């Protein structure tokens, strides 16, 4: 199959479809932007999230805002439903 496909003798439709990231290249690509450009352009976590989630280069204010959201939602004590379960679980000797 590998060989027949190389010589373009047979066609087989792909079962999967992606559009967020391409690891196959010389360089890693996040939604069309190569990883070096991501750092060079100083995107940040917000910027990277814009490419992977929306496949868009967002304005700086937008990125900074996303980062701000992530910061305020980071934690709200151990009394909440989720924190409680994680604590119970950690205490029951489980992994991260």
Q: Which residues bind a copy of itself (CB under 8 A)?
A: 1-2, 4, 8-14, 17, 26-28, 34-36, 39, 78-82, 84-85, 88-89, 91-95
The Cα 52–Cα 21 span in angstroms is: 7
Q: What is the nearest approach in angstroms of a copy of itself to the Cβ of residue 40?
A: 9
Neighbours of 51 (CB within 10 A): 20
Q: What is the nearest approach in angstroms of a copy of itself to the Cβ of residue 56?
A: 20
Q: What is the nearest approach in angstroms of a copy of itself to the Cβ of residue 96?
A: 8
Q: What is the nearest approach in angstroms of a copy of itself to the Cβ of residue 85?
A: 5
Pick between residue 1 and residue 61 the one whose CB is nearest to a copy of itself. Answer: 1
Give the β-pairing of 29-30 and 33-34.
antiparallel
| 66 φ/ψ sector (left φ>0, alpha ψ -120 to 50, else beta) | alpha
Pick between residue 73 and residue 91 the one whose CB is nearest to a copy of itself. Answer: 91
């Amino acid at each position: 199959y590998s060989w027949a496909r190389e010589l373009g003798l047979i066609r087989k439709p792909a079962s999967f479809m992606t559009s967020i990231c391409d690891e196959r290249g010389q360089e890693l690509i996040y939604a069309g932007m190569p990883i070096t450009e991501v750092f060079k352009e100083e995107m940040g976590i917000g910027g990277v999230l814009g490419l992977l989630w929306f496949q868009k280069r967002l304005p700086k204010y937008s990125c900074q805002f996303i980062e701000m959201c992530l910061m305020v939602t980071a934690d709200h004590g151990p009394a909440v439903s989720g924190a409680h379960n994680t604590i119970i679980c950690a205490r029951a000797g489980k992994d991260l």
